[PDB]
Amino acid sequence: VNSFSGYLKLTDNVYIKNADIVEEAKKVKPTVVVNAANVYLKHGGGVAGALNKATNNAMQVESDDYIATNGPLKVGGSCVLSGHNLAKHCLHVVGPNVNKGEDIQLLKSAYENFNQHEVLLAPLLSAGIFGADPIHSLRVCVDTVRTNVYLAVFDKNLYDKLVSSFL
Ligand SMILES: CC(C)(C)C[C@@H](CO)Nc1ncnc2[nH]ccc12
Numbered sequence: 737v738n739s740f741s742g743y744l745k746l747t748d749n750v751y752i753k754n755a756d757i758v759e760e761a762k763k764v765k766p767t768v769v770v771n772a773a774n775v776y777l778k779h780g781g782g783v784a785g786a787l788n789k790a791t792n793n794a795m796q797v798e799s800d801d802y803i804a805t806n807g808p809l810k811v812g813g814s815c816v817l818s819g820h821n822l823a824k825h826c827l828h829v830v831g832p833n834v835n836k837g838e839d840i841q842l843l844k845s846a847y848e849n850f851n852q853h854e855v856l857l858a859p860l861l862s863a864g865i866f867g868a869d870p871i872h873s874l875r876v877c878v879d880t881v882r883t884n885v886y887l888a889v890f891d892k893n894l895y896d897k898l899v900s901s902f903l
């Protein structure tokens with residue numbers, strides 16, 4: 737039993753809700769919140785900009801030190817950093833950005849990072865400003881993640897389409 741509330745159950749392990757991931761994180765304080773990161777951990781917009789703004793830029797400050805030490809992530813890769821005031825940890829996961837010409841096949845590799853964590857609050861990877869089809873992202877999530885994932889979908893209209901079209 738966990739404190740996630742109001743989710744629709746899609747499969748044994750995947751759950752979905754129309755919600756603002758920032759507000760969800762602030763309410764639940766999950767062990768892991770997933771950020772829709774880029775390889776530079778530059779949190780400018782979309783989910784990343786929103787999560788960073790909610791930390792009063794502390795996520796960006798921590799991320800800049802991480803990159804100075806380690807260099808950029810790989811597309812499809814991840815790193816674990818602090819969750820600041822939102823969660824215990826933030827798993828920064830880089831899905832392919834179609835608007836940069838990146839290989840959509842890397843979306844499965846990106847979701848594999850979730851399997852290193854028993855329970856996660858997450859957005860749909862590569863959706864939104866990353867340019868991929870959110871219906872496809874949900875399918876890859878369901879077919880790749882085996883741990884317990886709680887998906888927050890910001891857009892109510894898209895949420896309804898994802899639910900109604902879910903196989
Ligand atoms: C179409 C969507 C907006 C659902 C695309 C999604 C991509 O992951 N973005 C987000 N998802 C959940 N909470 C969020 N808060 C701020 C941005 C954001």
Ligand SMILES: [Cl-]
Pocket residue numbers: 781782783863864865866
């Ligand atoms: Cl977005």
